[PDB]
Design an enzyme around this catalytic site. Structure first.
Site, short mmCIF file in Angstrom:
data_model
loop_
_atom_site.label_atom_id
_atom_site.label_comp_id
_atom_site.label_asym_id
_atom_site.label_seq_id
_atom_site.Cartn_x
_atom_site.Cartn_y
_atom_site.Cartn_z
CG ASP A 87 -3.74 9.27 10.05
OD1 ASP A 87 -4.97 9.30 9.83
OD2 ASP A 87 -2.91 9.13 9.12
N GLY A 93 0.81 -1.22 0.00
CA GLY A 93 0.00 0.00 0.00
C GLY A 93 0.84 1.26 0.00
N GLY A 152 5.21 7.76 1.71
CA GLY A 152 5.96 6.69 0.98
C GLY A 152 5.13 5.44 0.69
CB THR A 153 5.50 2.59 -1.52
OG1 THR A 153 4.62 1.52 -1.87
CG2 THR A 153 6.95 2.10 -1.66
CB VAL A 154 3.74 -0.14 3.20
CG1 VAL A 154 4.04 -1.28 4.17
CG2 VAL A 154 3.57 1.17 3.97
C1 7KF Z 1 -1.71 -7.26 3.93
C2 7KF Z 1 -1.42 -5.79 4.10
C3 7KF Z 1 -2.03 -4.84 3.27
C4 7KF Z 1 -1.74 -3.49 3.43
C5 7KF Z 1 -0.85 -3.08 4.42
C6 7KF Z 1 -0.24 -4.02 5.26
N1 7KF Z 1 0.68 -3.71 6.29
C7 7KF Z 1 1.06 -2.49 6.81
N2 7KF Z 1 0.64 -1.30 6.37
C8 7KF Z 1 1.04 -0.14 6.93
N3 7KF Z 1 0.56 1.06 6.44
C9 7KF Z 1 -0.47 1.09 5.38
C10 7KF Z 1 -0.38 2.39 4.57
C11 7KF Z 1 -1.43 2.33 3.44
C12 7KF Z 1 -2.83 2.20 4.05
C13 7KF Z 1 -2.95 0.92 4.91
C14 7KF Z 1 -1.87 0.88 6.01
N4 7KF Z 1 -2.17 1.89 7.05
N5 7KF Z 1 1.90 -0.13 7.96
C15 7KF Z 1 2.37 -1.26 8.45
C16 7KF Z 1 1.98 -2.49 7.88
C17 7KF Z 1 2.60 -3.59 8.62
O1 7KF Z 1 2.40 -4.77 8.38
N6 7KF Z 1 3.35 -3.09 9.62
C18 7KF Z 1 3.31 -1.62 9.57
C19 7KF Z 1 -0.53 -5.38 5.08
#
Ligand code: 7KF
Length: 274
Positions: A129, A21, A23-25
């Site tokens: 947030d 998802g 920056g980028t994750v």
């Molecule tokens: C299967 C799946 C799908 C999407 C995200 C994750 N994991 C994480 N995502 C964030 N941030 C995103 C940013 C964008 C919108 C949603 C979330 N808020 N952050 C952390 C994760 C994670 O696994 N650890 C930290 C896992």
């Protein structure tokens, strides 16, 4: 932040090609002392550098089962923030795709968020947030609070963070005092937690649907609040409404909110055993 203390070796990190998802994750794999650990990595594509390092600096100071832990940071192709992986992803998307999830299960998860926030409140950090998109599921019965990019450590002499200007804010989650006075406290986070509760019991529906930010402010200023989601227990809607107390001083803190949720969760566990 001092990178030295929490610096990771890029050679020990393997990143997935796909994105989770943005920056980028992205999903990754870090070679720890012996085991390999599945991680979530926030990557960038001057200001944005400092915001990621500030986020890392907040996460470094927090140590709670219901908050996503930071593993460390690395400067490679860009700055990267390496965190625990929550495999089932954001709470709103999960509930949208899993409508069979029961009341008791939702209460369990929102209670976990309340325990994390009680800890955050005790630590004098404001999240800024707090929404269902930023609650991440390790399992169907284990939620963690994530996404500390807007988070602030409160000054030793003040109970709130005063923002200088109205930035790109998730206005539908924000308390009246955030909109009107730019003041963010643990009480503002409690307001947001109310909206999160509503999202959860609405199976990840967006709050205030079809309404502009300014229309939401006008609605709230008339004493109006979102209605009870279908099948939401009355006790939980009552708690939501208490979180949406207009006056910041009369609004409950997370200690009060957590205790209420904790007690109701035990009632529901009782009811289901019968
Ligand atoms: C299967 C799946 C799908 C999407 C995200 C994750 N994991 C994480 N995502 C964030 N941030 C995103 C940013 C964008 C919108 C949603 C979330 N808020 N952050 C952390 C994760 C994670 O696994 N650890 C930290 C896992």
């Amino acid at each position: 932040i001092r990178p030295k203390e929490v610096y990771l070796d890029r050679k020990l990190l393997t990143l997935e090609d796909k994105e989770l998802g943005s920056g980028t994750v992205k999903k990754g794999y870090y070679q720890m002392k012996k085991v390999v650990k599945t991680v979530a990595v926030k990557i960038l594509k001057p200001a944005l550098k400092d915001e990621l390092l500030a986020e890392a600096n907040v996460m470094q100071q927090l140590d709670n089962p219901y908050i996503v832990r930071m593993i460390g940071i690395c400067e490679a192709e860009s700055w990267m923030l390496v965190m625990e992986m929550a495999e089932l992803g954001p709470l709103n998307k999960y509930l949208q795709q899993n409508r069979h999830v029961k009341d008791k299960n939702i209460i369990e998860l929102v209670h976990q968020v309340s325990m994390g926030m009680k800890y955050l409140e005790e630590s004098n950090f404001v999240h800024r947030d707090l929404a269902a998109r930023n609650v991440l599921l390790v399992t169907q019965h284990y939620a963690k609070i994530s996404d500390f990019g807007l988070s602030k450590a409160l000054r030793a002499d003040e109970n709130y963070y005063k923002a200088q200007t109205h930035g790109k804010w998730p206005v539908k989650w924000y308390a009246p005092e955030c909109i009107n006075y730019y003041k963010f406290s643990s009480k503002s986070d409690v307001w947001s937690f109310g909206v999160l509760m509503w999202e959860a019991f609405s199976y990840g529906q967006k709050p205030y649907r079809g309404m502009k930010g300014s229309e939401v402010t006008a609605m709230l200023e008339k004493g109006e609040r979102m209605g009870c989601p279908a099948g939401c227990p009355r006790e939980m809607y009552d708690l939501m409404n208490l979180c949406w107390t207009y006056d910041v001083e009369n609004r409950p803190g997370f200690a009060a909110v957590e205790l209420r949720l904790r007690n109701y969760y035990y009632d529901v566990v009782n009811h289901h055993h019968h």
